[model samples]
Target: AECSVDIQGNDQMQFNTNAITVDKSCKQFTVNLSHPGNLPKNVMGHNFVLSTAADMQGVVTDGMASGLDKDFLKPDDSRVIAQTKLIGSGEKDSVTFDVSKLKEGEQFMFFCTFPGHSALMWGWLHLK
Candidate 1:
């Protein structure tokens, strides 16, 4: 569906795509993630976390303390608009959220919350 997308996370700490666009016509949006590398979750786990561009670093900063058991995300962090479960090699996870949560003029971003991963694993999200 036009409202959904597939994303990949590899051992290199990178997402296959760096940008995503959500169509305003879709009432909901979905993000599917897969880890194709040969590592364990504790070593190279990945999760999709979304928030405003301005909140990216802050989110990741606090998330580091949350640990992998919490999917590397702060519990109920209101800044988070959407997030997926963390997964290791050969595993998959997804998340869906109301499209209306996105505002037209706001800049959004998605990234991996695994400690230190955001440096190489982040992207822009656009609502069009």
Candidate 2:
């Protein structure tokens, strides 16, 4: 069976689900992200970015400099395993990545790198 997860971000700089799990049997995984609030991207945009927990700071800092038009992410950033486009005000987006990219013991994390949102809009992805 395929593995998939759902997450919701809001205008409050928060995500409804903080953690997700991916089954080892799946060859690929999908993250379906949605924004359930009524705010524009400039004020409350959100996106899902996956990388090692250790890379979060560098990713966010560089992504911020890259600007919002790039979805608050650096173009072709090697550290980003997968990422969805910025969505706002009931918009939704999803991204799928090969499960093989995930290692058995490595730590992984997901976050919304929309400027200052990382402080409250991050979570863990566990492979089990």
Candidate 3:
């Protein structure tokens, strides 16, 4: 199955889509992220990080301390199932992960760990 999604982030601390569907037949899933604005990363950067909804806060907290050089994410953090690189306006990044790692009945979320952005830049991922 074709398993891919195109997502957009902007300077307003928001993502274009709040939900993404992962097909069960897919061996792997991919997320293609893009920032259409012209701002720099420090001002309005974005990245895609995946984790369970229950783990969101803790993951974000730890990731905040990791800083931008680490893509604002904890290194080798097991909570992160998959993640893309931090990007600014006019830039893009992609992340791929094995679909087999996603378990049924577990709630998953995707968000940006760019400091205060998570409040508005979070979304849900569903396996179907």
Candidate 4:
């Protein structure tokens, strides 16, 4: 369905694409993540977390204190649309969710919430 994408995260605290386009025609969308760098998860870990752009503030802020146990995400945080497990060097993870979670005029943010990573590792998830 062309509804899936491969997003690579390296040790540079960034993603391969700044913009992720998801076709609305697809019932569900998938984000495949991989860390090809040679760093450990604690120092340079990465995870894919999607939420409304407006919710980024609260979601990211709260997730920071949630620790790595919950994958750095607040347990039962309703703002999260989809999230993947934290990955380190040579590791991979992915997240799949229904496209219906998106709404009109509301942009979804695909970012990493590893404490200070969101400031750099973030981009908009566009709906088409």
User: Cα lDDT of model 2 overall?
Assistant: 0.91
Give the TM-score of each candidate.
0.96, 0.96, 0.96, 0.95
lDDT of each residue in 1-128, candidate 2, tens digit only = 65898889998999998888899999999999999979999888999999998898899999999997888899989999999999989899999999999999777989999999999999998788
- Candidate 1 displacement at residue 66 in angstroms: 1.1
lDDT of 3 by residue, 5-114 (tens): 99999878899999998999999999999999889998789999999988889889998998888878989898899999899999999999999989987769999999
lDDT-superior candidate, 1 or 2 = 1
What is the per-residue lDDT of model 1 for residues 1-113, given as tens digits with 9 covering 90 to 100?
A: 49999999999999999999998899999999999979999999999999998888989998998887888889989999999998999999999999999999777999999
Backbone clashes in candidate 4 total 0
Give candidate 4 misplaced runs (Cα > 4 Å). Answer: none
Q: After superposition, how far is residue 59 of candidate 1 from its true place, in Å?
A: 1.0
Note the residue pairs that clash in candidate 1: none
RMSD of 1: 0.9
**Residue-wise C-alpha lDDT for candidate 4, range 1-128, written one tens digit per residue:** 69899999899998989898888799999999999989999889999999888898888889889988777889898898899988999999988899888886667888998999988899998787
Give the local distance difference test score of model 4: 0.89
The worst-scoring run of ten residues by lDDT in candidate 1 lies at: 67-76
Better of 3 and 4 by TM-score: 3
